[PDB]
């Protein structure tokens, strides 16, 4: 109605006029007023006026919250100490106290670093637990630990809405927009409320992120207490990293209550359900082993037939197609074809000894060296296959144990985490052989042993490989694959200052500056650190055409989750190195049609290195439209690397470190075919 009767009532500053006029404002405050509260110019004297002064503060914060203010709204409430499903409480509490306490917690969170804001935060916490509108008040109260008592104060019965919604979007915006320590608060408090609640596998992902030894204990006594089994052993062994499996088998071997977690803790019970169930319900065609095993020639496409042959591990005909196939093959193919028997025998542990024994202690050193490589690939928890290779170790120039050191140290690193493999690896790195893959599989071996460690050790292992890295400045491929293992030890954490320690004791000529930028690559697994994104765009134009490839290649690791920002204008540039950066930065994801378009444009190129390295990610991202790119390569080619690599794309077609290390080590194909001897022993494939 009109302001005729009530307008001359706010002008008198007398105490009774306030103590009866203000209750009328609380009565008519159900919808605020008839208008936008244009009475500010008349209540600005009440601002200076003060029996029921808390009601004057309530109406004052009501109107100041009503029109506009940034700091003066929550002062009448922090001084008021409020003591005096409707529309009144919803309006003055929900939105007015939402933005009100939001700007109070923001101003008091950014300005100063008492308990009045905590009492306001708990009062609004309870009132918005009665309001029951989720994720709004939550997404506003994210930034204010108090979040622990907030979650354990709220997570009592509402599990699907707060866990699914709050953990889903608050976890996404917690790895996207929230820094690390508050995400650690999400991990600990989520360990609390999720420890008291159900849905163990999401807490197992909280073990994939926490990497703590207590979570697996409480979830194994609780998952053991709450009665399938082989399935959660399978993805149990998949989600766990290299540390808590070794520590898991030592604490389960310390308890030995049932030994079923010891049985599930190794690679045996993750492969014994898969292989028979895969051979039974699936039937692969033989026209790709006969066809893709028939169009091979030139002693390289035949190597692609040893890899496609390695795809089987149903049909084991091309595997057992007589003999002399390795005898006709050259060294580059004696090692790869020697490891083919290891690729085709991932299961049948007992049969691996009687299948590889025919090639053991042979006449050619590469047949038995690749045979020990096979013995290292076929198993990772048997630890009873690497006795003869580890025994001798005494050549100091070359006698069957530098190549047997390649296969046995690389396959043993794949099947590795005791010190008494590095006490023996000390003369391995200290040997300093002219062969690149010695220090290659050494740094990759100890590096894959030290992945996900206790924040990273800077001991005489990486100190020794850095001193012996800078020992001689020859064969810079050592400087290209030693930072691989260095980064494998730096991997697992981003906030550590160990990368700056490498910036202290490593910085030199651009060789070890490329080492330092590799430590920069693997030491930034990913968080909210856009500072290195603008720094990425800043150092993106460096004259050195390799730290662009690796330092800019880190894109697929840094923003691996938020894939909407990963596509950029890297293809619109003119540097072929950048085209490689995007081409490799595509990844091995589900392969949407946009990626297939980026390979439809990146595929047509003239350089043999880019046209050689397109089908790896093209067919890794798509594992209908699978045979069209193969026909496209048949129309482009019809060099040798394009045909062997397109047959290897027929191989490819038809957050663990094990799926990240192999290709990152594989980003060195622009050299001699010696690297292609380590190409055949990748483990990132599924």
606 CB-contact burial (10 Å; exposed 0-12 / middle 13-18 / buried 19+) = exposed
Q: Which is nearer to another protein, 76 or 629 (CB)?
A: 629
Provide, rounded to whole angstroms, the least separation between the CB of residue 576 and another protein. Answer: 18
From 409-417, 449-457, 473-481, 627-635, give the range in contact with another protein by CB under 8 A: 627-635
**CA distances in angstroms from 475 to 517, 551, 672, listed in the order given:** 19, 21, 13
Provide, rounded to whole angstroms, the least separation between the CB of residue 628 and another protein. Answer: 5
From 38-46, 110-118, 329-337, 624-632, give the range in contact with another protein by CB under 8 A: 624-632
Q: Which is nearer to another protein, 456 or 629 (CB)?
A: 629
Provide, rounded to whole angstroms, the least separation between the CB of residue 232 and another protein. Answer: 32
Provide, rounded to whole angstroms, the least separation between the CB of residue 605 and another protein. Answer: 12
Provide, rounded to whole angstroms, the least separation between the CB of residue 281 and another protein. Answer: 15
Q: Which is nearer to another protein, 542 or 626 (CB)?
A: 626
Q: Which is nearer to another protein, 564 or 625 (CB)?
A: 625
Angle at 41 between CA 39 and CA 46, to 5 degrees: 85
From 72-80, 358-366, 396-404, 620-628, give the range in contact with another protein by CB under 8 A: 620-628
Provide, rounded to whole angstroms, the least separation between the CB of residue 272 and another protein. Answer: 29
Provide, rounded to whole angstroms, the least separation between the CB of residue 70 and another protein. Answer: 35
From 274-282, 525-533, 542-550, 622-630, give the range in contact with another protein by CB under 8 A: 622-630
Provide, rounded to whole angstroms, the least separation between the CB of residue 602 and another protein. Answer: 15
Q: Does 607 bind another protein (CB under 8 A)?
A: no
DSSP letters, 174-196, are HHHTS-HHHHHHHHHHHHHHHHH
Q: Is 298 left (phi over 0), alpha (psi -120 to 50) or beta?
A: left
From 137-145, 376-384, 495-503, 626-634, give the range in contact with another protein by CB under 8 A: 626-634
Q: How far is CA 522 from the centre of its chain?
A: 11
Q: How far is CA 95 from the centre of its chain?
A: 38
Provide, rounded to whole angstroms, the least separation between the CB of residue 606 and another protein. Answer: 10
**CA distances in angstroms from 24 to 30, 32, 93, 95, 562, listed in the order given:** 11, 12, 19, 22, 53
Provide, rounded to whole angstroms, the least separation between the CB of residue 289 and another protein. Answer: 16
The residues near 434 (Cβ < 8 Å, ≥ 6 apart) are 475
Tell me which of 530, 531, 625, 686 binds another protein, using CB under 8 A. 625
Q: Which is nearer to another protein, 133 or 628 (CB)?
A: 628
Distance CA 252, CA 267 (A): 15
Backbone angles phi, psi at 565, to 5 degrees: -90, -15
Binding mask 463-482 for another protein (x = CB under 8 A): --------------------
- Are 577 and 603 spatial neighbours (Cβ–Cβ below 8 Å)? no
Q: Which is nearer to another protein, 11 or 295 (CB)?
A: 295
Binding mask 180-219 for another protein (x = CB under 8 A): ----------------------------------------
Q: Which is nearer to another protein, 118 or 596 (CB)?
A: 596
Q: Does 624 bind another protein (CB under 8 A)?
A: yes
Q: Which is nearer to another protein, 623 or 631 (CB)?
A: 631
DSSP letters, 8-74, are GGSS---HHHHHHHHHHHHHGGGSS-SSS-TTHHHHTTTTT----HHHHHHHHHHHHHHS--SSSSS
Total number of residues that touch another protein (CB under 8 A)? 5
Q: Which is nearer to another protein, 407 or 629 (CB)?
A: 629
Distance CA 367, CA 658 (A): 26
Provide, rounded to whole angstroms, the least separation between the CB of residue 635 and another protein. Answer: 8
Q: Which is nearer to another protein, 350 or 593 (CB)?
A: 593
Tell me which of 47, 213, 238, 627 binds another protein, using CB under 8 A. 627
Q: Which is nearer to another protein, 500 or 627 (CB)?
A: 627
CA dihedral of residues 200, 201, 205, 210 (deg, nearest 10): 20
Q: Does 592 bind another protein (CB under 8 A)?
A: no
Nearest by Cα to 460 from 489, 491, 496: 489
Distance CA 571, CA 601 (A): 9
Over the Cα atoms of the chain, what is R_g? 32
Q: Which is nearer to another protein, 15 or 592 (CB)?
A: 592
Assign 3-class secondary structure to 138-176: HHHCCCCCHHHHHHHHHCCCCCHHHHHHHHHHHHHHHHH
Q: What are the percentages of helix, strand and coil residues in the chain, rounded to 5?
A: 60, 0, 40
From 141-149, 206-214, 397-405, 625-633, give the range in contact with another protein by CB under 8 A: 625-633
Distance CA 564, CA 56 (A): 51
Provide, rounded to whole angstroms, the least separation between the CB of residue 625 and another protein. Answer: 6
Tell me which of 631, 640, 655, 671 binds another protein, using CB under 8 A. 631
Provide, rounded to whole angstroms, the least separation between the CB of residue 631 and another protein. Answer: 7
Tell me which of 47, 590, 628, 655 binds another protein, using CB under 8 A. 628
**CA distances in angstroms from 456 to 132, 178, 314, 493, listed in the order given:** 44, 24, 42, 8
Provide, rounded to whole angstroms, the least separation between the CB of residue 591 and another protein. Answer: 13
Distance CA 658, CA 226 (A): 31
Q: Which is nearer to another protein, 504 or 627 (CB)?
A: 627
DSSP state of 545: T
Distance CA 129, CA 137 (A): 9
Q: Which is nearer to another protein, 476 or 628 (CB)?
A: 628
**Half-sphere exposure of residue 328, counting CA atoms within 13 Å on the CB side?**
11
Q: Which is nearer to another protein, 363 or 624 (CB)?
A: 624
Q: Which is nearer to another protein, 289 or 663 (CB)?
A: 289
From 155-163, 619-627, 646-654, 671-679, give the range in contact with another protein by CB under 8 A: 619-627
**CA distances in angstroms from 459 to 456, 463, 464, 480, 516, listed in the order given:** 9, 6, 8, 21, 17
Distance CA 650, CA 466 (A): 40
Binding mask 245-284 for another protein (x = CB under 8 A): ----------------------------------------
From 54-62, 382-390, 488-496, 621-629, give the range in contact with another protein by CB under 8 A: 621-629
Q: What does the binding site for another protein look like in residue numbers (CB under 8 A)? A: 624-625, 627-628, 631
């Amino acid at each position: 109605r009109d302001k005729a009767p009530v307008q001359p009532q706010q002008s008198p500053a007398a105490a009774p006029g306030g103590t009866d006029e203000k209750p009328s404002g609380k009565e008519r405050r159900d919808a605020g007023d008839k208008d936008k509260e244009q009475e500010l110019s008349e209540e600005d004297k009440q601002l200076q006026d003060e029996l029921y002064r808390p009601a004057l503060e309530e109406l004052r914060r009501q109107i100041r919250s009503s029109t506009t203010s940034m700091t003066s709204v929550p002062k009448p409430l922090k001084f008021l100490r409020p003591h005096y499903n409707k529309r009144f409480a919803a309006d003055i509490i929900s939105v007015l106290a939402m933005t009100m306490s939001g700007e109070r917690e923001c101003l008091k969170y950014r300005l100063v670093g008492a308990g009045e804001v905590a009492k306001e935060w708990q009062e609004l916490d309870d009132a918005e637990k009665v309001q029951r509108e989720p994720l709004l008040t939550l997404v506003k109260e994210i930034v204010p630990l108090l979040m622990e008592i907030e979650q354990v104060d709220m997570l009592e019965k509402d599990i699907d809405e707060n866990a699914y919604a709050k953990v889903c979007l608050y976890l996404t915006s917690c790895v996207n927009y929230v820094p690390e320590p508050e995400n650690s608060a999400l991990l600990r408090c989520a360990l609390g409320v999720f420890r008291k609640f159900s849905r163990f596998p999401e807490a197992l992902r909280l073990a994939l992120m926490l990497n703590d030894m207590e979570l697996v204990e409480d979830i194994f006594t609780s998952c053991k207490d709450v009665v399938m089994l082989g399935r959660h052993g399978v993805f149990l062994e998949l989600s766990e990293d290299v540390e808590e499996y070794e520590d898991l088998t030592e604490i389960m071997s310390n308890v030995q209550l049932n030994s079923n977690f010891l049985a599930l803790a190794r690679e045996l019970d993750i492969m014994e359900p898969k292989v028979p169930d895969d051979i039974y319900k699936t039937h692969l065609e033989n026209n790709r082993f006969g066809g893709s095993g028939s169009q091979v020639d030139s002693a390289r496409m035949n190597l692609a037939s040893s890899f496609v042959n390695g795809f089987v591990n149903q049909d084991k005909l091309l595997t057992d197609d007589g003999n002399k196939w390795l005898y006709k093959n050259k060294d580059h193919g004696m090692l790869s074809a020697a490891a083919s028997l290891g690729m085709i025998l991932l299961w049948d542990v007992d049969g691996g000894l009687t299948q590889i024994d025919k090639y053991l202690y042979s006449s050619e050193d590469y047949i038995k060296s690749g045979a020990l490589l096979a013995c290292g690939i076929v198993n990772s928890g048997v630890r009873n296959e690497c006795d003869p290779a580890l025994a001798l170790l005494s050549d100091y120039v070359l006698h069957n144990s530098n190549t047997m050191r390649l296969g046995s140290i690389f396959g043993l690193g794949l099947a590795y985490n005791r010190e008494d493999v590095l006490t023996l690896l000390l003369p391995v790195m200290g040997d300093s052989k002219s062969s690149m893959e010695v220090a290659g599989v050494t740094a990759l071996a100890c590096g894959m042993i030290a992945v996900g460690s206790c924040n990273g050790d800077v001991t005489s292992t990486i100190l020794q490989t850095i001193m012996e890295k800078s020992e001689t400045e020859l064969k810079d491929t050592y400087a290209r694959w030693l930072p691989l293992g260095l980064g494998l030890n730096h991997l697992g954490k981003g906030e550590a200052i160990e990368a700056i320690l490498a910036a202290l004791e490593v910085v030199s000529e651009p060789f070890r500056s490329f080492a330092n930028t590799l430590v920069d690559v693997c030491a930034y697994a990913g968080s909210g650190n856009v500072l290195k994104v603008q720094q990425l765009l800043h150092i993106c134009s460096e004259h050195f055409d390799s730290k662009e490839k690796e330092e800019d290649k880190d894109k697929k690791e840094k923003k691996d989750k938020d894939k909407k920002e990963a596509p950029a204008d890297m293809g619109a540039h003119q540097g072929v190195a950048v085209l490689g950066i995007a081409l490799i930065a595509m990844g091995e994801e589900i392969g949407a049609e946009m990626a297939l378009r980026t390979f439809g444009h990146l595929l047509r190129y003239g350089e043999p290195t880019l046209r050689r390295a397109v089908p790896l990610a093209l067919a890794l991202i798509s594992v209908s439209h699978d045979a069209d790119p193969e026909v496209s390569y048949n129309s482009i080619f019809a060099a040798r690397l394009a045909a062997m690599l397109r047959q290897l794309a027929q191989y490819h077609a038809k957050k663990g470190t094990l799926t990240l290390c192999p290709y990152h080590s594989d980003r060195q194909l622009m050299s001699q075919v010696a690297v292609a001897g380590l190409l055949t022993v990748l483990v990132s494939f599924l």
